[PDB]
Amino acid sequence: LTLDEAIKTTNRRVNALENVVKPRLENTITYIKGELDELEREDFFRLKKIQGYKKREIERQLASS
Amino acid sequence: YGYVRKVSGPVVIADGMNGAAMYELVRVGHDNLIGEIIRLEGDSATIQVYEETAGLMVNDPVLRTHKPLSVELGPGILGNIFDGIQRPLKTIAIRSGDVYIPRGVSVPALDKDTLWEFQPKKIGEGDLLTGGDLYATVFENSLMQHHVALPPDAMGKVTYVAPAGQYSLKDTVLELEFQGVKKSFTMLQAWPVRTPRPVSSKLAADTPLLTGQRVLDALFPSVLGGTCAIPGAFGCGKTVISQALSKYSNSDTVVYVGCGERGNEMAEVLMDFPQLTMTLPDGREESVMKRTTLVANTSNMPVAAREASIYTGITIAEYFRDMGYNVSMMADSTSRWAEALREISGRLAEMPADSGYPAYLAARLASFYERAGKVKCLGGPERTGSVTIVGAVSPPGGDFSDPVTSATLSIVQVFWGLDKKLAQRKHFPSVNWLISYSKYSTALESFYEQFDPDFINIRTKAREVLQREDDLNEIVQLVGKDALAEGDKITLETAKLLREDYLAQNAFTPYDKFCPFYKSVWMMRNIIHFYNLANQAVITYTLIKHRLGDLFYRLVSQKFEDPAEGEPALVAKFKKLHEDLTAGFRALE
Amino acid sequence: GGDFSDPVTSATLSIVQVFWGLDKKLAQRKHFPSVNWLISYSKYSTALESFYEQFDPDFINIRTKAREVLQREDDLNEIVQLVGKDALAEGDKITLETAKLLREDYLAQNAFTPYDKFCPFYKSVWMMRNIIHFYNLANQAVEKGAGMDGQKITYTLIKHRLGDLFYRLVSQKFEDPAEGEPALVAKFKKLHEDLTAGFRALEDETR
Amino acid sequence: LEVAMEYRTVTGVAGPLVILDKVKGPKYYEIVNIRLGDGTMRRGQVLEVDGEKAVVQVFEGTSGIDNKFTTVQFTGEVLKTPVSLDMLGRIFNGSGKPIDNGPPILPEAYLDISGSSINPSERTYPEEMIQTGISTIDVMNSIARGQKIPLFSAAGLPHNEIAAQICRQAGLVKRLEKDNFAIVFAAMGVNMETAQFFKRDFEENGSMERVTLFLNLANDPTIERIITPRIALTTAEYLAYECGKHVLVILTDMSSYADALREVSAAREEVPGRRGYPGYMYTDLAQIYERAGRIEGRKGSITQIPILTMPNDDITHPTPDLTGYITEGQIYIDRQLQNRQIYPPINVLPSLSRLMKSAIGEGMTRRDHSDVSNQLYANYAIGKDVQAMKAVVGEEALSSEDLLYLEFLDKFERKFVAQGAYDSRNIFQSLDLAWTLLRIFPRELLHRIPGKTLDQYYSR
Amino acid sequence: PLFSAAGLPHNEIAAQICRQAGLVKRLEKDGEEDNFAIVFAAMGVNMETAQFFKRDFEENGSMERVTLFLNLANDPTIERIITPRIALTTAEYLAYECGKHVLVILTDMSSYADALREVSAAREEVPGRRGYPGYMYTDLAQIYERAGRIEGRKGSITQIPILTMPNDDITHPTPDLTGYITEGQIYIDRQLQNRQIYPPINVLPSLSRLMKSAIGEGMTRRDHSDVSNQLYANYAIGKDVQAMKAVVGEEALSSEDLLYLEFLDKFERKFVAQGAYDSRNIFQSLDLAWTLLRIFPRELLHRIPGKTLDQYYSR
Amino acid sequence: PLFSAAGLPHNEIAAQICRQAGLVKRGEEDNFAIVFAAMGVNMETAQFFKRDFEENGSMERVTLFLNLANDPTIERIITPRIALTTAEYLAYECGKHVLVILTDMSSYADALREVSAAREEVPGRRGYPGYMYTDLAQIYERAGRIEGRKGSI
Amino acid sequence: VVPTVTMLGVMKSRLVGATRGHALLKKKSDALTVQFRQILKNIV
């Protein structure tokens, strides 16, 4: 009886719990890195583009004078 | 002509370069710093300089080169040591005397003043020749004769042929005219690393890469001109397989390519190669360096050189294959190359992709790997070479999920799968049979059956035995060996014998240092045939075990046979033990 | 509510010498001083050696023993979360009893009452010494194994036939500091003497 | 022979940067001195240059600078640190100015920092051991002259105490085999209190003729924290290959160095790299590390034991995960061992040296080194497993061997690892202690020990 | 601020609070100045919610007292960044300069963070967390710190700004900053709603910084703090026990474990649940809490002091 | 489509389907003409496709649009466009039913990702372009039957 | 669950603890199975 109970618990942990957690860890890793890190670069890239556009506009306005 | 205007770290902007071309290498500053052109915005250029740009002066001169990242090929390419950007480390060290690499060295890739023995073919002074024609060959050293192929994209009727004699690369060994204009060719050929080498037709690979190790030769064979993958991070298996390829592989040449690994590791490996020596089948003793070229770029080297080392090595291998030689490249650490590419992309602010690598990483890896294959030569006379890549991979923590690992597994046909668990269990081959595979077996089956029609069936039976080995493993795990039947016990015993006698090699031992394919085939036959002959008799397993107990010791002895006695003597001994084992199996039944 | 990966947190911990890391879990359980004793640290423990030596030449050892007890309890909490206290031996059981007593008596403080409004150093060191002495004596007793049982049987013996000392230990936090050091010190010395009477009287009849 | 022009064309100040207007022919990484309106002096480095423009990053901050009273006097240099053989035995500031109440260094050469790389053809495999005095290092995770072995730690863990112990007790194993050992000690961004600790340790060590304490506080300017490890590596390279002396270097808290590089890169308006750290941080750390190694043509060597802080007590952090590839080892400091009050909390079982086999040998060290190391490893693992089992099996059913492994684990944790802060231990007596722990098991039980060694040493 | 997620009845409990809020001192408290003169400011509300609040205020007989500033979802977005400021200015004038206790219900502060995001994005400014403006903390401080009693005047301002977490979390910048600034946090959990309890208020995440000041022997039963601190501890420890029993089985639980589980059941059912139109007197609530507590023996009641135990453990 | 991870025999299944393709027959001129796009295939796979198609004898009714991995990454994007345009001409403007096949659509996705990252466009999930849905529509959303014509794609 | 760096750390810690507990339970089950086999042999 004790071996049956222990084997049931061990099999449940091996099959259900760990295989439940590991996809959760993968999804959490993907949500952070796959989205937040990508957005941060995109936000900063758009900001750098805005700065470059401002500099180009200033230079063109100065040249037109 | 050309002066810098803005020097922001690696990035450099130089004016007065209207005629510059994209990706054209350039010399920057008095120190002759070398960098590649990226953007040609306006009349100005934009250059990323590989070595450190500290100390550059505004209006310091910039000198164009009119050539992309290229390698100077020809005689003397073998044996030496080269950096990522094709810089001869040995001659640089000799010339400068000191140890440190000078910031702005200008030593040519190959010594243009050294003399090599030259002799032309039977071509006439007024004949016709085209690109890829083999007009002469050179004895660069003993037993590594070097053919001199007329460079591609050059053709015309012969005008001058240099008679046989002592010459240097600076000499004009050949001159010819296609139109009224005439061109003179030396013995040095320059070719961009990014552009592959011209080919006539991509053949179908039809000859295995006999590595000298039984596990790679028979269980998971690899074919000449075929990609290979190694998950090499520990256990020295990568060093072992590289040594095996250098010493015993069928390849006429080897081109090791090391990028971005530990500096002391490259020191160890580059001191190991000269110590490595291989005996000729004719009984001669040679040095592997006489057929080995080494391109090592440690971490201290500039990141761009680290990325370009792989292309340099593959271009060198292609040039070697241009004269029909079978050559094998060995990318030491593709993971380091990918990290270098990631650093370069971060420098360029390219939009990050999966796990941070740039979106073209998979495409560039595929483009690099697609250069391997058995190829018909360009130009006459008719011959055919091959280029096979055995580039390894270093997955993080062994998790085959990183984009580098995934792309490599998607492109590479044959993956050998070294396992650290076997290394912990003291396994010399360290090849995990449960994960390795050879997708080229279907194409290699023609030669496999031509050598022995029963060998392929033996391989299939061995694969089935390996598949049942894990089944018997959990069978013993859950209930034990008691529940195993006589046939099941025989199968388990044969699987264990195969694992511990033939699937494993002894490397260090002189008798098992090199495993000929003949000895491997006879061992496989003597194992599988005995396994079957014992199998159909099901006789009590214990009774069979007692009767075959001497045979089990004999099978270990059959593996212990040295190759010194020659392939037939070892084959006859394996056959005699197999015949005695078969006689015991049938008569006692 | 945020891990130490927070840039402000990492920057502070790269410079700050003593980290009184309060844990929200303790705040849920309404443990009011709420310092997590597993993650907190104090790099000043070496410079204070002279002061600790001159005040009480044995405080360092009892503090290290208390740290070891807390760490051992936190270590086997995971094992208990899987199997349970059924397999816990005498040493483990007594260690957990002492850890629980330390957690609820020593590490807690109301601060809204004269019992815990302000605890002087002498009272705190006396509580620590009393608890550690009880732990050491109980461990020695259960290791003696007299009466052919010892062990967890002796643990139950000291938790039932000697539990008045345990109750006085867990109520020692209420020693009013207003009574003065000469009174509280005498009371704690008497409690220490009574504790030494235990685990020797308990060993008199061999459990 | 050229006196550098002192431009007074400040045309913009923002943060740590100042943008000059019309500098004539600058240099990319030039070094410039600033004389403010009040007369105070500041030294600044030149960042990206352009047409007649030169952005200058200023040390000590930029407060008080005005666009009409501040002179920016160029030099035309790239920070050649003064180097000499008498640099030993003195404490230096972050930027190299001595703070040991002594004179400035009279230099035998002006070596430019960030020296050129070693030719990989000229390297040679590391050999011989380097005694550190800590048993956990010299027995199970041996160190060889020429390795680059990190010491991964975390905030709160006593990294600096181990650093001081290594600095004091370091020595050459070859004493019994039959003094050219120097310890360039670099500390980047230390706390204000640990500065006193380092000053005390290097002011009463007893072997001052060996160490050189480059010190860079936390409140010192950041660019000093970038330059400090480079100065230390340059001085070590000189004393190793230009003076034929074995050299050891300890880099403290290179995570702070990475943060400093991050701070500098952002000021140049560069886009941040992966996980915030710049993408070129791999190149920077490779540049810092690869300066080590053994040179065939020189009798000297450089061995690095860089101390790195792993944030959040995990290795997934970009700096530890990045430095894992470059180096060939990992000596972790474990928080639980610190809680268990074992003073050197080195988690020996997780820790390893990728090339510990070179240190073990016959000529160097002792014959039984590898055998005892493997036996200790295996027995520790077994003891940990047995303790875990006893946590759940009640410990009554454990066999005799289980109790032997339990007591061995207890003895190894409480007598071997827990070395005192000042108990210097030669490798021979360390191995004698290892044999003392080993001899508890029966001679036949030590399966991992080869023959002819048990007969030699198991008899005690 | 009431922390909620999409779908939870935060509006319903806000209306219940508006209908039921009143003084407590010695249960004694016309009181026209004591009338809370509720000022309701709705930003980005579905028209059904606006109609609901309007009808509730009309039905409760407070139509002569309450005041409504509405910025519906279809209404222009920018006005949502002015409506709460207008409401707070009106509350300040009604309380400080007129001597009326005032209560404010800001609705869907996330619908204000959205306006901040839109304005910041339209200006090409440097973003912050999740692209929100870097100064969202300053704006939230400016919108929250305008409530509190003032020494020189008899008025007062007490605001209950309800909040909607985007994906039912707390690390989101807006609820995070609100928790940083505001002196409280009431948590409505999806788990309780899934179990069909009308007030889904999870009492464990809950917090009030000024709780220790409102209670006391002068205005409440002397045991109030003890009672609260014990129920919280038992609920938290019982939740841990239930989590353990979820894997070790109901059989492996001990007698104390069973007591904790029964306490959890009766706490979540009899105690937390309350009528959508029925109030509870503070003393009646304390009586119910004492009935819940008296499940455990006197020994287990560690937090409660013996002095309060003697006067209350029997009753 | 066929969902099949790398290393699986999906290429062999596609080849078998193309060689054995036919109507229910419950006619030869209007019989299945197969347009076989090949985006980013290996050289060995390319030779296998050519040999297998030549062996079945149905070369008379099959068109190969081969694009190896050696070819430029941008040139892979226009291969499905060309294949589907030729299919449209064969089916609607000539009559015969077309069975369009495209191998390694993930290679096309990678080509889209590379091209988008080159121009620095707004990234969707996993760094892919934010308009990938529209592009995959313009590729896929052409199969169907038009009322006035007897063709079918 | 809501994704965050702290959440990722908590999930990693839970996975590690689950692996350790699974190993401990497997060891206990193996010991109990050995004892059961011994008891069965004794009964036989």
Q: Considering only CB atoms, which chain E residues are within 8 Å of C84?
A: 248, 252
- Other C-beta atoms within 10 Å of D332: how many? 23
Identify which of D113, D97, D91 has the alpha carbon closest to the alpha carbon of residue D230.
D113
Mapped onto helix, strand or coil, the DSSP state of residue D252 is strand
Closest-CA residue in chain E for A10?
E247
A59 touches chain B (CB under 8 A): no
Q: What does the angle CA E237 – CA E240 – CA E242 come to, to the nearest 5 degrees?
A: 110
Do strands E39-45 and E101-107 pair parallel, antiparallel, or not at all (unpaired)? Answer: parallel
Mapped onto helix, strand or coil, the DSSP state of residue D402 is helix
Q: Give this entry's resolution in angstroms.
A: 4.1
Q: Judge whether C13 and C4 are in contact, CB under 8 Å.
A: yes
Matching residue, tokens 């109301």: C110
D268 touches chain A (CB under 8 A): no
Q: Of the candidates C15, C67, C79, which has its C-beta nearest D191's C-beta? A: C15
Mapped onto helix, strand or coil, the DSSP state of residue D293 is strand
The CA distance from G42 to the nearest CA of chain D, in Å, is 18
Identify which of C114, C25, C109, C35 has the alpha carbon closest to the alpha carbon of residue E233.
C25
Q: Judge whether D145 and D295 are in contact, CB under 8 Å.
A: no
- Give partners of D (≥3 CB pairs < 8 A): A, B, C, G
Give the CB-side neighbour count of residue E138, counting CA atoms within 13 A: 4
C3 touches chain G (CB under 8 A): yes
- Other C-beta atoms within 10 Å of D65: how many? 17
Taking the C-alpha atoms of residue B423 and residue B415, their distance in angstroms, rounded to an integer, is 18
Mapped onto helix, strand or coil, the DSSP state of residue C116 is coil
Touch of C by D (3+ CB pairs closer than 8 Å)? yes
Identify which of D385, B471, D378, B422 has the alpha carbon closest to the alpha carbon of residue G26.
D385
Inter-chain CB proximity E244 and C81 less than 8 Å: yes
Matching residue, tokens 């990050």: B352
**What does residue D279 show for φ and ψ, rounded to 5 degrees?**
-60, -30
Mapped onto helix, strand or coil, the DSSP state of residue E291 is helix
Q: Of the candidates D25, D119, D280, which has its C-beta nearest B58's C-beta? A: D25
Q: Considering only CB atoms, which chain B residues are within 8 Å of D114?
A: 52, 54
Touch of C by B (3+ CB pairs closer than 8 Å)? no
Inter-chain CB pairs, A–F, below 8 Å: 9
B401 touches chain A (CB under 8 A): no
How many angstroms from the chain centroid is the CA of residue B340? Answer: 20
- Other C-beta atoms within 10 Å of E164: how many? 23
A31 touches chain D (CB under 8 A): no
C75 touches chain G (CB under 8 A): no
Taking the C-alpha atoms of residue B255 and residue B269, their distance in angstroms, rounded to an integer, is 13
B342 touches chain D (CB under 8 A): yes
Total count of residues recorded for chain B:
589
Q: Which of residues 144-183 of E touch G (CB under 8 A)?
A: 167-171
Answer whether the bond into residue B381 is a cis peptide, omega within 30°.
Answer: yes
Taking the C-alpha atoms of residue C103 and residue C31, their distance in angstroms, rounded to an integer, is 9
How many angstroms from the chain centroid is the CA of residue E230? Answer: 20
Tokens of F130: 């934010």
Mapped onto helix, strand or coil, the DSSP state of residue F30 is coil
Helices (H), D129-215: 135-138, 159-169, 192-201
Burial of residue B456, with CB atoms counted within 10 A of its CB: 0-12 exposed, 13-18 middle, 19 or more buried: middle
Instruction: Give the orientation angle of helix B334-348 with respect to helix D281-289, to 10 degrees.
Output: 130
Taking the C-alpha atoms of residue G44 and residue G41, their distance in angstroms, rounded to an integer, is 5
Q: What does the angle CA D188 – CA A41 – CA D29 come to, to the nearest 5 degrees?
A: 45
Touch of E by D (3+ CB pairs closer than 8 Å)? no
**What does residue B147 show for φ and ψ, rounded to 5 degrees?**
-80, 145
E strand or H helix that includes residue C169:
helix C163-171
Which residues are CB-contacts of D129 (< 8 A; sequence separation ≥ 6)? D138, D142, D143, D144, D145, D173, D359, D360, D364, D365, D427
G16 touches chain A (CB under 8 A): no
Total count of residues recorded for chain E:
315
Q: Considering only CB atoms, which chain G residues are within 8 Å of D397?
A: 31
Identify which of B471, B476, B463, B485 has the alpha carbon closest to the alpha carbon of residue B540.
B485
Q: Considering only CB atoms, which chain C residues are within 8 Å of D155?
A: 4, 10, 13-14, 19
A41 touches chain D (CB under 8 A): yes
Taking the C-alpha atoms of residue B225 and residue D433, their distance in angstroms, rounded to an integer, is 56
Strand blocks (E) in chain C: 18-19, 41-42
Inter-chain CB proximity D47 and B8 less than 8 Å: yes
Q: Of the candidates D312, D314, D392, which has its C-beta nearest G24's C-beta? A: D392
G9 touches chain D (CB under 8 A): yes
Concatenate the DSSP letters of all residues of G6-44 into one string. Answer: HHHHHHHHHHHHHHHHHHHHHHHHHHHHHHHHHHHHHH-
Q: Under an 8 Å CB criterion, which residues of A touch G?
A: 2-3, 6-7, 9-10, 13-14, 17-18, 21-22, 24-25, 27-29, 31-32
Q: Considering only CB atoms, which chain E residues are within 8 Å of G6?
A: 171
Instruction: Give the orientation angle of helix G5-43 with respect to helix D369-393, to 10 degrees.
Output: 80
- Give, as one character, the DSSP assignment of residue B94: H
Q: Judge whether E230 and E303 are in contact, CB under 8 Å.
A: yes
Inter-chain CB proximity D48 and B264 less than 8 Å: no
Distances (CA, A) of E193 to B128, E107, E201, E269, F46: 91, 20, 9, 12, 59
Instruction: Give the orientation angle of helix D369-393 with respect to helix D400-411, to 10 degrees.
Output: 110
Burial of residue D41, with CB atoms counted within 10 A of its CB: 0-12 exposed, 13-18 middle, 19 or more buried: exposed
Taking the C-alpha atoms of residue B437 and residue E16, their distance in angstroms, rounded to an integer, is 69
E strand or H helix that includes residue B27:
strand B25-28
Strand partners, E208: E184
Inter-chain CB proximity D298 and B8 less than 8 Å: no
Chain G interface test: which of D393, D396, D402 (most G C-beta within 10 Å)? D393
Which residues are CB-contacts of E278 (< 8 A; sequence separation ≥ 6)? none
Concatenate the DSSP letters of all residues of B65-92 into one string. Answer: -SS-SEEEESTT-SS-EE-TTS-BHHHH
Taking the C-alpha atoms of residue E174 and residue E140, their distance in angstroms, rounded to an integer, is 9
Strand partners, D187: D215, D252
**What does residue B185 show for φ and ψ, rounded to 5 degrees?**
-110, 135
Identify which of B170, B140, B471 has the alpha carbon closest to the alpha carbon of residue B323.
B140
Mapped onto helix, strand or coil, the DSSP state of residue B58 is coil
Taking the C-alpha atoms of residue D426 and residue D131, their distance in angstroms, rounded to an integer, is 7
Mapped onto helix, strand or coil, the DSSP state of residue D397 is coil
Strand blocks (E) in D36-74: 41-49, 54-58, 71-74
Residue B228 among known ligand-binding residues = no
Inter-chain CB pairs, C–G, below 8 Å: 19
Taking the C-alpha atoms of residue E260 and residue E238, their distance in angstroms, rounded to an integer, is 5
Taking the C-alpha atoms of residue D150 and residue B396, their distance in angstroms, rounded to an integer, is 18
Identify which of D281, D273, D232 has the alpha carbon closest to the alpha carbon of residue D256.
D281
Which residues are CB-contacts of F69 (< 8 A; sequence separation ≥ 6)? B363, B366, B367, B370, F40, F41, F42, F43, F107
| Calculated CA dihedral for residues D205, D206, D211, D212, nearest 10 degrees | 70
Inter-chain CB proximity E171 and C1 less than 8 Å: yes
The b-or-e profile of D200-219 (16+ CB within 10 A means b, else e) is ebbeebeeeebbbbbbbbbe
Matching residue, tokens 């500039």: B302
Q: Judge whether F102 and F108 are in contact, CB under 8 Å.
A: yes
D109 touches chain G (CB under 8 A): no
Instruction: Give the orientation angle of helix F78-92 with respect to helix F132-140, to 10 degrees.
Output: 30
A48 touches chain D (CB under 8 A): yes
> At residue D250, what is the residue type?
I
Mapped onto helix, strand or coil, the DSSP state of residue E119 is helix
Taking the C-alpha atoms of residue D167 and residue D248, their distance in angstroms, rounded to an integer, is 9
The b-or-e profile of B317-356 (16+ CB within 10 A means b, else e) is bbbbbbbbbbbbbbbbbbbbbbbbbbbbbbbebbbbbbbb
Q: Judge whether B256 and B293 are in contact, CB under 8 Å.
A: yes
Q: What does the angle CA B15 – CA B16 – CA B20 come to, to the nearest 5 degrees?
A: 100
Tokens of D379: 């027995």
Tokens of D359: 């240190």
Tokens of D106: 């009279």
Q: What is the side-by-side order of every strand in the sheet holding B146-149?
A: B146-149, B134-138, B115-120, B165-168
Taking the C-alpha atoms of residue D291 and residue D251, their distance in angstroms, rounded to an integer, is 13
Strand partners, D333: D346
Taking the C-alpha atoms of residue D133 and residue D429, their distance in angstroms, rounded to an integer, is 10
Inter-chain CB proximity C68 and D336 less than 8 Å: no
Identify which of B406, B476, B442 has the alpha carbon closest to the alpha carbon of residue B226.
B442
A49 touches chain D (CB under 8 A): no
Handedness of CA B54, B55, B56, B57 (dihedral sign): positive
The greatest distance separating any two alpha carbons of chain A, rounded to the nearest whole angstrom, comes to 94
Q: Of the candidates B58, B102, B267, which has its C-beta nearest D116's C-beta? A: B102
Residue B235 among known ligand-binding residues = yes
The b-or-e profile of D2-16 (16+ CB within 10 A means b, else e) is eeeeebebbeebeeb
3-state secondary structure F45-102: HHHHHHHHHHHCCHHHHEEEEEEECCCCCHHHCHHHHHHHHHHHHHHHCCCCCECCEE
The b-or-e profile of B159-176 (16+ CB within 10 A means b, else e) is bebbeeeebbbeeebbbb
E strand or H helix that includes residue D71:
strand D71-74
Strand blocks (E) in D259-386: 293-295, 301-304, 307-309, 329-330, 352-353
Q: Judge whether C34 and C27 are in contact, CB under 8 Å.
A: yes
Strand partners, D73: D6, D33
Helices (H), E9-161: 10-20, 47-59, 83-95, 110-122, 136-144
Inter-chain CB proximity G24 and C5 less than 8 Å: no
Identify which of E133, E154, E38, E40 has the alpha carbon closest to the alpha carbon of residue E86.
E40
Strand blocks (E) in D144-267: 151-153, 171-172, 181-190, 211-217, 246-252
Q: What does the angle CA C178 – CA C183 – CA C186 come to, to the nearest 5 degrees?
A: 145
If phi over 0 gives left and psi between -120 and 50 gives alpha, with beta otherwise, what is residue E89?
alpha
> At residue B351, what is the residue type?
M
Inter-chain CB proximity B339 and D282 less than 8 Å: yes
Matching residue, tokens 């009224």: B180
Tokens of D435: 């044999």
Taking the C-alpha atoms of residue D424 and residue D168, their distance in angstroms, rounded to an integer, is 9
Which residues are CB-contacts of B425 (< 8 A; sequence separation ≥ 6)? none
Chain A interface test: which of D268, D269, D270, D271 (most A C-beta within 10 Å)? D271
Q: Considering only CB atoms, which chain C residues are within 8 Å of E237?
A: 29
Identify which of B13, B17, B15, B57 has the alpha carbon closest to the alpha carbon of residue B35.
B13
Do strands D17-20 and D91-92 pair parallel, antiparallel, or not at all (unpaired)? Answer: unpaired
